[PDB]
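Researcher: Last one for today. Full complex below.
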Amino acid sequence: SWEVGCGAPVPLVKCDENSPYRTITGDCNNRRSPALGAANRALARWLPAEYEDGLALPFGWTQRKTRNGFRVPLAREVSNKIVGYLDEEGVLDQNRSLLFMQWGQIVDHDLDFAPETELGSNEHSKTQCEEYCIQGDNCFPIMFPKNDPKLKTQGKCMPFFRAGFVCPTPPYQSLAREQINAVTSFLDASLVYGSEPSLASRLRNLSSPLGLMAVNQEAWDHGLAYLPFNNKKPSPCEFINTTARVPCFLAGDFRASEQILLATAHTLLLREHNRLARELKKLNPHWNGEKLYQEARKILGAFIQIITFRDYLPIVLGSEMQKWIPPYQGYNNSVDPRISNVFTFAFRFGHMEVPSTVSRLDENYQPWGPEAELPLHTLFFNTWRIIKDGGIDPLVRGLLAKKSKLMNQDKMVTSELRNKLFQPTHKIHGFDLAAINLQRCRDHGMPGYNSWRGFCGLSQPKTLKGLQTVLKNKILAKKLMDLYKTPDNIDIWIGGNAEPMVERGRVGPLLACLLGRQFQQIRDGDRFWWENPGVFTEKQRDSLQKVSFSRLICDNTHITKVPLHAFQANNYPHDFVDCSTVDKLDLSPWASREN
Ligand code: HEM
Ligand SMILES: *[C@@H]1O[C@H](CO)[C@@H](O[C@@H]2O[C@H](CO)[C@@H](O[C@H]3O[C@H](CO)[C@@H](O)[C@H](O)[C@@H]3O)[C@H](O)[C@H]2NC(C)=O)[C@H](O)[C@H]1NC(C)=O
Ligand SMILES: *[C@@H]1O[C@H](CO)[C@@H](O[C@@H]2O[C@H](CO)[C@@H](O[C@H]3O[C@H](CO)[C@@H](O)[C@H](O)[C@@H]3O)[C@H](O)[C@H]2NC(C)=O)[C@H](O)[C@H]1NC(C)=O
Ligand SMILES: *[C@@H]1O[C@H](CO)[C@@H](O[C@@H]2O[C@H](CO)[C@@H](O)[C@H](O)[C@H]2NC(C)=O)[C@H](O)[C@H]1NC(C)=O
Ligand SMILES: *[C@@H]1O[C@H](CO)[C@@H](O[C@@H]2O[C@H](CO)[C@@H](O)[C@H](O)[C@H]2NC(C)=O)[C@H](O)[C@H]1NC(C)=O
Ligand SMILES: CC(=O)Oc1ccccc1C(=O)O
Ligand SMILES: [Ca+2]
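Model: Here's the assembly. Have a good evening.
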């Protein structure tokens, strides 16, 4: 007895059915089932949700009710006893650049987003939750441990609000609570253009027929464009330095300004759209604005898909790549392209790949300025360092020259994120991303670690000795058992990230399975997949294969020296070469004659 009635809270509209361009909402990708993969709908469930009361309450909500007979440990204790570490030396990935971490975040924001719940416009819940830590409704505070240093200095808890769900959003009940995915599931560059008709429009430059995206008018970066500033005050980007008063950037995705390197990436993409746009006009002068926008937009969509599947996943999945994502075989209308709820947690392996600092390099790739190496935490929502401290070129050079942080069982998430994370809504640099993650697993009703091992057809340890063998680490297996009392209770996020990495990969067996299935699906169930005959012509595909992130760089910055394989670790100057030597995207294949 199914129930696929519920739904209304979703911007719907008619379909075109022979239109060459994706919709902004993702609707109409699948002809037989039009809303599949669309934005503002529930994340798919690969396994039933698991809640304390079976419907909506998270485990750890009612301190008396246990999970399989035990209390589930506070997310912060787990963070404190397993995730943290003090010594940053020797933690860098010797063969993965900072861009490896950054691209990952870009693909993830393109694929999923479960925003937190409102009712908080002119609200005291917004305060009944941070001031008094009173658990209730959408307020599910992260309590502090005994002997936590934040006690003495911050309070009794860390505010936290539950994720939005479907049908309603206020006081609801009836079916199992399913979270929302506010963005399109397809890998379509929805982070550049937006996932709603409203925002998509406001991002475009409609005062002219060039099909360009709107750009900043207050500042330019050596003639090159900037994303436009965001309208909305109070702005968090101006709170971190009230004297600079530089607001956050307005982009296709709302998280664009979490960190300076994510804003740099967004800007690089924006710039490529315009470039691509003024170039296409030049070859097809008659084309109107719409045509220029959609056509460029589609090129860029094909760009992200290529870099992701050709250069990124192969070094995440490693030797497991082929076991999950076989050679492409054409569009399969039976494949469900929805992002699963658990994927949004599996893709968080990236948080353990973020180093403690971000550097800026001058033209010889040497420290730019005296205070060239900044601590990550000073850059959450920091837009002023771009506008008033050198533009994006210095940051992009750091992306190519510095390394990512290597995931390590005894050194998982840097303190820059574990103790000094900054939230919009709040006023301090004192949050814990690791604790938030674990708290979010419960909020989302995730099955335990062993449910997912079974799902992926992997052994399921029940004993300490069993876990030691799987983690291949006596001590970690030990800390994990003392806190969870059973491997069945280990949250998927930490459980999955504690496994050793597969050959040539950066994730373990469980994650490779979870990541692998998701990408196989978004590819096979995407009617607009770039390799799908009819989407692009044979001659356009031969052109799209030469796309390189190195090139993207060359055409949108004043960097003339770039690595050929920007994801592996490269040393300047030996592994860098003049832009004049890098393949360029040939657009002549897009020229459409007449008569
Ligand atoms: C600061 C943060 C980052 C780097 C300095 C960072 C980075 C990543 C990478 C590199 C990811 C994948 C390769 C990735 C995935 C996901 N993130 Fe994370 N991220 C930073 C900060 C945050 C915060 C805060 C959140 C929200 C947590 C919450 O539950 O409230 C966050 C989330 C996620 C996320 C879940 C997305 C969703 O579907 O709603 C990823 C898949 N990141 N990040
Ligand atoms: C640092 O990481 C690099 C990438 O993981 C790695 O180099 C890669 O090694 C693989 C070995 O399989 C090779 O991959 C390509 O091999 C041929 C090209 O000759 C292609 O037809 C294949 O499809 C495949 O893409 C490459 O040699 C290289 N891959 C890339 C994309 O450059 C380095 O070995 C790592 N460094 C160390 C010290 O381990
Ligand atoms: C808030 O943003 C301010 C910039 O808008 C920043 O100060 C700026 O940064 C330094 C001061 O440390 C100055 O630049 C340096 O270079 C000039 C070159 O002309 C030299 O004269 C000095 O050595 C100078 O330090 C900027 O001029 C300065 N701008 C202003 C208005 O002060 C603040 O440090 C930021 N505050 C925080 C807390 O981050
Ligand atoms: C929309 O596009 C127009 C045309 O490209 C932009 O107008 C130009 O702006 C730059 C710098 O201000 C200069 O070349 C001229 O002042 C304008 N040229 C023309 C032909 O108008 C305009 O800035 C864009 N609008 C937004 C909001 O980004
Ligand atoms: C299209 O995708 C479907 C759905 O994933 C594939 O279906 C599987 O095919 C086998 C063999 O026919 C069925 O017995 C299974 O029930 C399906 N598995 C699952 C998990 O649904 C199908 O193989 C794909 N077809 C093509 C031509 O690619
Ligand atoms: C980065 C991520 O996914 O987070 C955010 C998005 C929008 C606004 C704030 C944040 C954050 O919590 O730092
Ligand atoms: Ca998308």
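Residues 1-595 form a domain with the Myeloperoxidase, subunit C fold (CATH 1.10.640.10). The first strand starts at residue 41 and ends at 42.
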